[PDB]
Every structure is written in C-alpha cells, then in structure tokens.
Write a protein that binds this ligand. Structure first.
Ligand SMILES: [Mg+2]
Ligand SMILES: [Mg+2]
Ligand SMILES: [Mg+2]
Ligand SMILES: [Mg+2]
Ligand SMILES: [Mg+2]
Ligand SMILES: [Mg+2]
Ligand SMILES: [Mg+2]
Ligand SMILES: [Mg+2]
Ligand SMILES: [Mg+2]
Ligand SMILES: [Mg+2]
Ligand SMILES: [Mg+2]
Ligand SMILES: [Mg+2]
Ligand SMILES: [Mg+2]
Ligand SMILES: [Mg+2]
Ligand SMILES: [Mg+2]
Ligand SMILES: [Mg+2]
Ligand SMILES: [Mg+2]
Ligand SMILES: [Mg+2]
Length: 88
RNA sequence: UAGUCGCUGGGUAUAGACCCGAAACCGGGCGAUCUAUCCAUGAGCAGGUUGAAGGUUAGGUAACACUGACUGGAGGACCG
C-alpha cells in the first residue's frame, strides 16, 4: 500500500550506510509503516481475510527481524524501538 | 190466566270491594364528602447493606479484543 515517494523518504530517514536498503532498521521501518497504514483499510473491510493474511505475514517478518537485531546489537535495538514507538 | 213504580232485605255486575302482608315492574328526580378508576396541584418515606453500566491507570494485542487495581453508584435489589 506504500508509494514510491513514501518508501524513498522512509529509507532516507532510516538509512544507516548511505544507500543500504537491506539493513534491519530500514526493513523494520517499512514494515511498521505498512502495518500502520493498513489499519484503516481493515477498519472498514472486516470480511477481507485474504489481505489480512498478508498483514500477518508482515507482522511475523518484523518480529523475526527485531529478534535478530536484538540478538546482534542491543544499542541499535533500543534506538530502533524508541524511534518506531512500539512496545517490543 | 196483570202489570208497573217505590220502600226494606238476600244475591249479582263494575269499581281498592271484608282487613292486613310480598319478592317485583315503570316514570321524574337525589347522590363519586364512603368506595372504584381518572385529572390537576402539593408532601412523605429513621437507620444500615450489596454493589451493575461507565471512567482512570498499569499490563497485553498488528489493532480490536482481553486481565488487575482504584473509582463509580444502578436496581418494580436486600435487612429494618
Ligand atoms: Mg214490589
Ligand atoms: Mg237488592
Ligand atoms: Mg244487596
Ligand atoms: Mg261486595
Ligand atoms: Mg292490603
Ligand atoms: Mg300482615
Ligand atoms: Mg327511579
Ligand atoms: Mg347515595
Ligand atoms: Mg373525593
Ligand atoms: Mg384498590
Ligand atoms: Mg403530586
Ligand atoms: Mg436515609
Ligand atoms: Mg426503579
Ligand atoms: Mg427501573
Ligand atoms: Mg411494583
Ligand atoms: Mg425493594
Ligand atoms: Mg423489609
Ligand atoms: Mg415491620
């Protein structure tokens, strides 16, 4: 549901090596933006299970990436959790 | 082959007709200061319990859900 401009400004805001789209932080930010964006769509369309499957897949991907990042570096983990405003 | 009109008595008819005695029917009125409903305007209900919805907060959820604590004061509720 994201746009080209939205993704570009997200990666610009969260890039860590001036051209890295694969670092955990960028992917986590993109997934969080998409999850937050799809909420209002699912507010109106409660009977759309087929898309909610993809939403759950994105949630699982974000969870796994956060777990890996926490396992690797605690400081970057805490910083990312702080900026994204999510519990854990 | 004598009837008529009085008077006095015994009967009869129509009248309450020897006297007392119903439950009832019909007509015009009087009553909702009792009581039954209703309408307007007032006032009365000591004292003590229980504790719904809701709210706040801390968790928790992708989000809605869902838990605890505090609060709150419902009811043809409870004891009197
Ligand atoms: Mg004579
Ligand atoms: Mg005579
Ligand atoms: Mg006589
Ligand atoms: Mg007589
Ligand atoms: Mg008589
Ligand atoms: Mg008698
Ligand atoms: Mg009468
Ligand atoms: Mg009377
Ligand atoms: Mg009266
Ligand atoms: Mg009565
Ligand atoms: Mg009154
Ligand atoms: Mg009282
Ligand atoms: Mg009541
Ligand atoms: Mg009531
Ligand atoms: Mg009653
Ligand atoms: Mg009662
Ligand atoms: Mg009682
Ligand atoms: Mg008593």
């Amino acid at each position: 549901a994201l746009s080209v401009e939205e993704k570009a400004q997200i990666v610009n805001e969260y890039k860590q090596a001036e051209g890295d789209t694969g670092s955990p932080e960028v992917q986590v930010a993109l997934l969080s933006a998409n999850i937050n964006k799809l909420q209002d769509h699912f507010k109106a369309n409660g009977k759309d299970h087929h898309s909610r499957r993809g939403l759950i897949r994105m949630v699982n991907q974000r969870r796994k990436l956060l777990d890996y990042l926490k396992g690797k570096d605690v400081s970057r983990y805490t910083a990312l959790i702080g900026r994204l405003g999510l519990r854990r």
